[PDB]
Design an enzyme around this catalytic site. Structure first.
Site, PDB file in Angstrom:
ATOM      1  N   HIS A  69       0.635  -4.226   3.846  1.00 35.75           N
ATOM      2  CA  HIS A  69      -0.584  -4.226   3.932  1.00 35.75           C
ATOM      3  C   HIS A  69      -1.751  -5.407   3.743  1.00 35.75           C
ATOM      4  O   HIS A  69      -3.090  -5.531   3.406  1.00 35.75           O
ATOM      5  CB  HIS A  69      -1.344  -3.175   3.111  1.00 35.75           C
ATOM      6  CG  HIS A  69      -2.584  -2.470   3.226  1.00 35.75           C
ATOM      7  ND1 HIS A  69      -3.844  -3.484   4.439  1.00 35.75           N
ATOM      8  CD2 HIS A  69      -2.741  -1.358   3.802  1.00 35.75           C
ATOM      9  CE1 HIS A  69      -3.846  -2.892   5.016  1.00 35.75           C
ATOM     10  NE2 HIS A  69      -4.236  -1.784   4.875  1.00 35.75           N
ATOM     11  N   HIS A 127      -7.583   5.794  10.312  1.00 32.32           N
ATOM     12  CA  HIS A 127      -6.739   6.130   9.361  1.00 32.32           C
ATOM     13  C   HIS A 127      -7.429   5.368   8.155  1.00 32.32           C
ATOM     14  O   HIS A 127      -8.766   4.359   8.057  1.00 32.32           O
ATOM     15  CB  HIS A 127      -5.657   5.251   8.615  1.00 32.32           C
ATOM     16  CG  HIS A 127      -5.020   5.499   7.226  1.00 32.32           C
ATOM     17  ND1 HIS A 127      -4.648   6.596   6.443  1.00 32.32           N
ATOM     18  CD2 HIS A 127      -5.191   4.451   6.530  1.00 32.32           C
ATOM     19  CE1 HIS A 127      -4.045   6.695   5.523  1.00 32.32           C
ATOM     20  NE2 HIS A 127      -4.276   5.256   4.987  1.00 32.32           N
ATOM     21  N   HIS A 163       0.792  -1.526   0.167  1.00 33.23           N
ATOM     22  CA  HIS A 163      -0.324  -0.327   0.038  1.00 33.23           C
ATOM     23  C   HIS A 163       0.838   1.227   0.047  1.00 33.23           C
ATOM     24  O   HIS A 163       1.740   1.611   0.567  1.00 33.23           O
ATOM     25  CB  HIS A 163      -0.786  -0.087   1.161  1.00 33.23           C
ATOM     26  CG  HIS A 163      -1.973   1.523   1.589  1.00 33.23           C
ATOM     27  ND1 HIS A 163      -2.629   1.593   0.102  1.00 33.23           N
ATOM     28  CD2 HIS A 163      -1.870   1.806   2.310  1.00 33.23           C
ATOM     29  CE1 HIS A 163      -2.813   2.727   1.398  1.00 33.23           C
ATOM     30  NE2 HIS A 163      -2.613   3.223   2.335  1.00 33.23           N
ATOM     31  N   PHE A 208     -10.368  -4.291  13.950  1.00 36.03           N
ATOM     32  CA  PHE A 208     -10.728  -2.912  14.168  1.00 36.03           C
ATOM     33  C   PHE A 208     -10.870  -1.906  12.609  1.00 36.03           C
ATOM     34  O   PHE A 208      -9.677  -1.378  12.575  1.00 36.03           O
ATOM     35  CB  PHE A 208      -9.908  -2.235  15.010  1.00 36.03           C
ATOM     36  CG  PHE A 208     -10.654  -1.195  15.469  1.00 36.03           C
ATOM     37  CD1 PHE A 208     -11.828  -1.027  16.257  1.00 36.03           C
ATOM     38  CD2 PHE A 208      -9.856  -0.556  16.938  1.00 36.03           C
ATOM     39  CE1 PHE A 208     -12.425  -0.048  16.699  1.00 36.03           C
ATOM     40  CE2 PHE A 208     -10.206   0.229  17.629  1.00 36.03           C
ATOM     41  CZ  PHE A 208     -11.716   0.356  17.092  1.00 36.03           C
ATOM     42  N   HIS A 255      -8.226   5.004   3.220  1.00 29.39           N
ATOM     43  CA  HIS A 255      -7.668   4.958   2.316  1.00 29.39           C
ATOM     44  C   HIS A 255      -8.568   5.844   1.501  1.00 29.39           C
ATOM     45  O   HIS A 255      -9.448   6.367   1.274  1.00 29.39           O
ATOM     46  CB  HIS A 255      -7.836   3.427   1.868  1.00 29.39           C
ATOM     47  CG  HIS A 255      -6.273   2.678   2.270  1.00 29.39           C
ATOM     48  ND1 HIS A 255      -6.032   1.783   1.684  1.00 29.39           N
ATOM     49  CD2 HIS A 255      -6.802   2.109   3.935  1.00 29.39           C
ATOM     50  CE1 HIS A 255      -5.505   0.845   2.668  1.00 29.39           C
ATOM     51  NE2 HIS A 255      -5.462   1.177   4.087  1.00 29.39           N
ATOM     52  N   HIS A 281      -9.435   2.005   9.335  1.00 30.33           N
ATOM     53  CA  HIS A 281      -9.160   1.345  10.276  1.00 30.33           C
ATOM     54  C   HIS A 281      -7.744   1.926  11.387  1.00 30.33           C
ATOM     55  O   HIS A 281      -7.240   2.725  10.552  1.00 30.33           O
ATOM     56  CB  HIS A 281      -8.299  -0.355   9.868  1.00 30.33           C
ATOM     57  CG  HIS A 281      -7.686   0.018   8.828  1.00 30.33           C
ATOM     58  ND1 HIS A 281      -5.879   0.558   9.200  1.00 30.33           N
ATOM     59  CD2 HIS A 281      -7.181   0.283   7.452  1.00 30.33           C
ATOM     60  CE1 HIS A 281      -4.668   0.454   8.357  1.00 30.33           C
ATOM     61  NE2 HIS A 281      -5.654   0.642   7.086  1.00 30.33           N
ATOM     62  N   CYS A 282      -8.038   0.834  11.993  1.00 28.92           N
ATOM     63  CA  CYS A 282      -6.749   1.703  13.328  1.00 28.92           C
ATOM     64  C   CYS A 282      -5.262   1.364  12.671  1.00 28.92           C
ATOM     65  O   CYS A 282      -5.478   0.103  11.727  1.00 28.92           O
ATOM     66  CB  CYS A 282      -7.136   0.607  14.303  1.00 28.92           C
ATOM     67  SG  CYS A 282      -6.103   1.632  15.638  1.00 28.92           S
ATOM     68  N   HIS A 283      -4.945   2.272  12.441  1.00 32.89           N
ATOM     69  CA  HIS A 283      -3.300   1.927  12.048  1.00 32.89           C
ATOM     70  C   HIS A 283      -2.260   0.904  12.958  1.00 32.89           C
ATOM     71  O   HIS A 283      -1.292   1.344  12.627  1.00 32.89           O
ATOM     72  CB  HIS A 283      -2.699   3.128  11.181  1.00 32.89           C
ATOM     73  CG  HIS A 283      -1.904   2.616  10.488  1.00 32.89           C
ATOM     74  ND1 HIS A 283      -1.013   2.349   9.826  1.00 32.89           N
ATOM     75  CD2 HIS A 283      -1.824   3.253   8.841  1.00 32.89           C
ATOM     76  CE1 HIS A 283      -0.162   2.246   8.636  1.00 32.89           C
ATOM     77  NE2 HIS A 283      -0.639   2.550   8.211  1.00 32.89           N
ATOM     78  N   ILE A 284      -2.920   0.783  13.650  1.00 29.09           N
ATOM     79  CA  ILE A 284      -1.995   0.054  14.575  1.00 29.09           C
ATOM     80  C   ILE A 284      -2.231  -1.074  14.620  1.00 29.09           C
ATOM     81  O   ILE A 284      -3.527  -1.878  14.751  1.00 29.09           O
ATOM     82  CB  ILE A 284      -2.584   0.118  16.819  1.00 29.09           C
ATOM     83  CG1 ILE A 284      -2.114   1.780  17.126  1.00 29.09           C
ATOM     84  CG2 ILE A 284      -1.854  -0.776  17.321  1.00 29.09           C
ATOM     85  CD1 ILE A 284      -2.511   1.887  18.261  1.00 29.09           C
ATOM     86  N   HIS A 294      -4.374  -3.762  15.816  1.00 27.11           N
ATOM     87  CA  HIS A 294      -5.784  -4.015  16.437  1.00 27.11           C
ATOM     88  C   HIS A 294      -6.012  -4.475  14.978  1.00 27.11           C
ATOM     89  O   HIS A 294      -7.205  -5.079  15.004  1.00 27.11           O
ATOM     90  CB  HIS A 294      -5.470  -2.241  16.626  1.00 27.11           C
ATOM     91  CG  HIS A 294      -5.322  -1.922  18.449  1.00 27.11           C
ATOM     92  ND1 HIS A 294      -5.266  -1.219  18.230  1.00 27.11           N
ATOM     93  CD2 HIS A 294      -4.256  -3.123  19.394  1.00 27.11           C
ATOM     94  CE1 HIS A 294      -4.907  -1.327  20.137  1.00 27.11           C
ATOM     95  NE2 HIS A 294      -4.119  -2.317  20.058  1.00 27.11           N
ATOM     96  N   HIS A 354      -5.789   4.960  19.817  1.00 27.06           N
ATOM     97  CA  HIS A 354      -6.490   4.701  18.725  1.00 27.06           C
ATOM     98  C   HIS A 354      -6.044   5.726  16.966  1.00 27.06           C
ATOM     99  O   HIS A 354      -6.785   6.265  16.975  1.00 27.06           O
ATOM    100  CB  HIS A 354      -7.018   3.722  18.000  1.00 27.06           C
ATOM    101  CG  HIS A 354      -7.345   2.903  19.591  1.00 27.06           C
ATOM    102  ND1 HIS A 354      -7.058   1.515  19.358  1.00 27.06           N
ATOM    103  CD2 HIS A 354      -8.602   2.666  20.235  1.00 27.06           C
ATOM    104  CE1 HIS A 354      -7.661   1.333  20.295  1.00 27.06           C
ATOM    105  NE2 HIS A 354      -8.317   1.489  20.525  1.00 27.06           N
ATOM    106  N   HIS A 364       0.634   4.697   1.379  1.00 22.71           N
ATOM    107  CA  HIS A 364      -0.240   5.060   1.872  1.00 22.71           C
ATOM    108  C   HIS A 364       0.096   6.740   1.909  1.00 22.71           C
ATOM    109  O   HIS A 364       0.981   7.554   1.609  1.00 22.71           O
ATOM    110  CB  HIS A 364       0.915   5.124   3.758  1.00 22.71           C
ATOM    111  CG  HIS A 364      -0.418   5.419   4.297  1.00 22.71           C
ATOM    112  ND1 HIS A 364      -0.988   4.827   5.180  1.00 22.71           N
ATOM    113  CD2 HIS A 364      -0.553   6.514   5.221  1.00 22.71           C
ATOM    114  CE1 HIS A 364      -1.490   5.738   6.466  1.00 22.71           C
ATOM    115  NE2 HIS A 364      -1.347   7.094   6.027  1.00 22.71           N
ATOM    116  N   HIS A 421       4.325   0.248   2.383  1.00 26.21           N
ATOM    117  CA  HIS A 421       4.344  -0.437   3.521  1.00 26.21           C
ATOM    118  C   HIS A 421       3.503  -1.936   3.281  1.00 26.21           C
ATOM    119  O   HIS A 421       2.533  -1.970   2.103  1.00 26.21           O
ATOM    120  CB  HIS A 421       3.929   0.075   4.555  1.00 26.21           C
ATOM    121  CG  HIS A 421       2.473   0.216   5.055  1.00 26.21           C
ATOM    122  ND1 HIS A 421       1.605  -0.988   4.959  1.00 26.21           N
ATOM    123  CD2 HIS A 421       1.868   1.694   5.330  1.00 26.21           C
ATOM    124  CE1 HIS A 421       0.171  -0.121   5.476  1.00 26.21           C
ATOM    125  NE2 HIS A 421       0.690   1.292   5.460  1.00 26.21           N
TER     126      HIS A 421
HETATM  127 CU   LIG Z   1      -5.609   0.438  17.699  1.00 22.42          CU
HETATM  128 CU   LIG Z   2      -0.635   2.963   6.380  1.00 22.76          CU
HETATM  129 CU   LIG Z   3      -3.573   4.278   3.998  1.00 17.08          CU
HETATM  130 CU   LIG Z   4      -5.370   0.519   5.206  1.00 16.49          CU
END
Ligand SMILES: [Cu+2]
Ligand SMILES: [Cu+2]
Ligand SMILES: [Cu+2]
Ligand SMILES: [Cu+2]
Ligand SMILES: *[C@@H]1O[C@H](CO)[C@@H](O[C@@H]2O[C@H](CO)[C@@H](O)[C@H](O)[C@H]2NC(C)=O)[C@H](O)[C@H]1NC(C)=O
Ligand SMILES: *[C@@H]1O[C@H](CO)[C@@H](O[C@@H]2O[C@H](CO)[C@@H](O)[C@H](O)[C@H]2NC(C)=O)[C@H](O)[C@H]1NC(C)=O
Ligand code: NA
Length: 499
Positions: free
Chosen positions: A112, A400, A65, A463, A402, A452-455, A458, A397, A67, A110
C-alpha cells in the site's frame, strides 16, 4: 503451505516469468502471488515484515495492507502509506500485530505504497471459521481451492504515466497465464478436482485495474461469501469480479471426468482466448493430461447481478429507508480531468506526516489535518451514508473503504435502492453514467480510514479521501507500539525529509 497466524514475511526483489517474459518484481515470500497467510477467526496475527528490497526502480521502501480486516484498536497496523504509517525502510522489519475478532472469510494482502503492489507484492489472506455456517455445503476448502486473478505488466509500475489508461500484458490465474502480444505457449495453471466432491473455491481479485468475467466451462458456481460476508446460496454461470473483491463459490465436480477451460476475460487488454490467453485448466483426477476442448457459450444465461445477493445472517441496513436517511448523509463529487482524479474538488496527494500521527500529535479537527480538503471527519456511533455517483473517466471504478464493510444500498446499473436486505461488502463497482451507488455503515471504529478507487493507477492519480472516524477517541482507542513510533523518524532520516 499456508503461513501464519504468527510468521515472518520477507519482501525481496527477483526475476520472474509468469507469462514467459522475464522481468524483475517485488515479492512476498519469494513467489507471485505471495504465500497464503491464514488463521482462524479471532486469532492474533503477528506478521513480521522484513523489507529486503534493493532495486530503486520498484521503490526500496514498503508498507503492507491487510485488505478487508477491520483493525479495530489497531489502526496503526492497517498499512496505507502516509495514512496510518510511514513506510518501512530497507534493511528494517516491522511487526504487524493485530487481531481478527468477528471476521471470517476470504481476504488478501498487498503493498500500500504508491503502485508497488502492481510490481508483485500481493497474496491471499484467509480467516477460516471452525463453526462455519456454510461448512456442510462442501467437502474441500484448503490452499488448493484458492483461485487468484491478476493483471501483469511488462513495464515496471514506476514507469507508468500518472492518470494514463495503463494496459496489462497478461492475465494470470494462480500466478500463470499467457501474454496478449508475442504470445508463447508458457505453462497454464491447473486446478485439480475429484469427480463427485464439492469444493469451496475462494476467488480473489488481486488486480491493479481490470475487472474479469470469470467462468468455468460446463460448470456453474454457487456463491456463499462476498468480500468476507456470508451470503445466501446464489447459483450463477459467470461472475464479473472487480479489483480487490472476493467470492467463495461451491464447485460441484459433477461433470464427466475431463478437462475444462477456466476463463477470466479482462475489460481491457487482450480480448478472447486465442493461444490460451485469459485461461487456466480445470482437470478431473483420471483425465488425460491435455488442454481442454470445451467451448464458452455465446452469452451467459445466469450471470451474477449484485442485487441478487443477500446476507446469510439478518444484517438489515442501518438508518431509515430513504435517501439521506442517516445521521451523516454524504454525497461525494467524483471527477477526473487532465490526468488527475478528485473527490469534492481535491486530488489526493499523500501528506508528509501520516494522518494517524497528525491526530496522535493533537490535531483534532479535519480542517487541521493534511492534506487540506482530503480528510473528512465522521462522528462516532452514527449511521453514515455515502453516495458515489459515477461518470468520472476510466470506469467502472471499484470503491473500497478501510476499517469497515458496508451495506450496498444501491448497486450499479439499477436505480432502485434496497433498504431491507442488500449484500454487505468492502469493495463495490460504482457503475456507469447516471448511477448512484450508495453505501451505509455505522461508526464504531475510531481512526483514519482510507476511501479510494481500488484501480491502483487511479489511487496514484488522486482518487481518494480519508475518513477521520471519531477523531476525539482515536488516541485512546489505538495505543501504538514503540516500533510504530520509530517508523517516521527512520523513514524521514533515510530520505532527508524534515518534519
Ligand atoms: Cu478508478
Ligand atoms: Cu486492497
Ligand atoms: Cu483495504
Ligand atoms: Cu487502500
Ligand atoms: C444520489 O443520491 C443523493 C442522495 O443520497 C442525491 O443527493 C441530493 O442531491 C441534490 C442535488 O443534486 C440535493 O438537493 C440534496 O440535498 C441531496 N441529498 C438528498 C436528496 O438526500 C444525489 O443528487 C444523487 N445523484 C445522482 C446522480 O442521482
Ligand atoms: C434492481 O434492484 C432492486 C432493489 O435491490 C431489485 O428489487 C428487488 O427485487 C427483488 C427480487 O424480485 C424483490 O424481492 C424485492 O422486493 C425488490 N426490492 C425492491 C426495493 O424493489 C431488482 O430486482 C433489481 N433489478 C434487476 C433487473 O435485477
Ligand atoms: Na434497518
Amino acid at each position: 503451505a499456508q503461513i501464519g497466524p504468527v510468521t515472518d514475511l520477507h519482501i525481496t526483489n527477483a526475476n520472474i516469468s509468469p507469462d514467459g517474459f522475464s522481468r524483475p518484481a517485488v515479492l512476498a515470500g519469494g513467489t507471485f502471488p505471495g504465500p497464503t497467510i491464514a488463521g482462524n477467526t479471532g486469532d492474533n496475527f503477528q506478521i513480521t515484515v522484513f523489507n529486503d528490497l534493493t532495486d530503486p526502480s520498484m521503490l526500496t521502501d514498503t508498507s503492507i495492507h491487510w485488505h478487508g480486516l477491520f483493525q479495530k484498536g489497531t489502526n496503526w497496523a492497517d498499512g496505507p502509506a502516509f495514512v496510518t504509517q510511514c513506510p518501512i525502510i530497507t534493511g528494517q522489519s516491522f511487526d504487524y500485530n493485530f487481531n481478527v475478532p468477528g471476521q471470517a472469510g476470504t481476504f488478501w494482502y498487498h503493498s500500500h505504497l504508491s503502485t508497488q503492489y502492481c510490481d508483485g507484492l500481493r497474496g491471499p489472506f484467509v480467516v477460516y471459521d471452525p463453526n462455519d455456517p456454510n461448512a456442510s455445503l462442501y467437502d474441500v476448502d484448503d490452499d488448493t481451492t484458492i483461485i487468484t486473478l491478476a493483471d501483469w505488466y511488462h513495464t515496471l509500475a514506476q514507469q507508468e504515466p500518472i492518470g494514463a489508461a495503463i494496459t496489462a500484458d497478461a492475465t494470470l490465474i494462480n500466478g500463470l497465464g499467457r501474454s496478449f502480444t508475442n504470445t508463447t505457449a508458457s505453462p497454464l495453471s491447473v486446478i485439480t478436482v475429484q469427480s463427485g466432491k464439492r469444493y469451496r473455491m475462494r476467488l480473489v481479485s488481486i488486480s491493479c485495474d481490470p475487472n474479469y468475467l470469470f467462468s468455468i466451462d460446463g460448470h456453474d458456481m454457487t456463491i456463499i461469501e462476498v468480500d468476507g460476508v456470508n451470503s445466501q446460496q446464489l447459483t450463477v454461470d459467470q461472475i464479473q469480479i472487480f479489483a480487490a473483491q472476493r467470492y467463495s463459490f461451491v464447485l460441484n465436480a459433477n461433470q464427466p471426468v475431463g478437462n475444462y477451460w477456466i476463463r477470466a476475460q479482462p475489460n481491457s487488454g487482450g480480448q478472447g482466448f486465442d493461444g490460451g490467453i485469459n485461461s487456466a485448466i480445470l482437470r478431473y483426477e483420471g483425465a488425460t493430461v491435455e488442454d481442454p476442448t470445451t467451448t464458452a457459450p455465446t452469452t451467459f444465461s445466469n450471470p451474477l447481478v449484485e442485487t441478487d445477493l443477500h446476507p446469510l445472517a439478518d444484517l438489515g441496513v442501518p438508518g431509515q429507508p430513504f435517501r439521506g436517511g442517516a445521521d451523516d448523509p454524504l454525497v461525494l463529487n467524483l471527477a477526473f480531468a487532465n490526468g488527475r482524479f478528485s473527490i469534492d474538488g481535491v486530488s489526493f496527494v499523500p501528506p508528509t506526516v501520516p494522518v494517524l500521527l497528525q491526530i496522535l500529535s493533537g490535531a483534532q479537527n479535519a480542517q487541521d489535518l493534511l492534506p487540506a480538503g482530503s480528510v473528512i471527519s465522521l462522528p462516532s456511533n452514527s449511521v453514515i451514508e455515502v453516495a458515489l455517483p459515477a461518470g468520472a473517466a476510466g470506469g467502472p471504478h471499484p470503491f473500497h473503504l478501510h476499517g469497515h464493510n458496508f451495506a450496498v444500498v444501491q448497486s450499479a446499473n439499477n436505480a432502485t435502492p434496497n433498504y431491507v436486505n442488500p449484500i454487505w461488502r468492502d469493495t463495490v463497482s460504482i457503475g456507469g453514467t447516471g448511477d448512484n451507488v450508495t453505501i451505509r455503515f455505522t461508526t464504531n471504529n475510531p481512526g483514519p480510514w482510507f476511501l479510494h478507487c481500488h484501480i491502483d493507477w487511479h489511487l496514484e492519480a488522486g482518487f481518494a479521501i480519508v475518513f477521520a472516524e471519531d477523531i476525539p477517541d482515536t488516541a485512546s482507542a489505538n495505543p501504538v507500539p514503540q516500533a510504530w513510533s520509530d517508523l517516521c523518524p527512520a523513514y524521514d532520516q533515510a530520505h532527508n525529509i524534515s518534519t
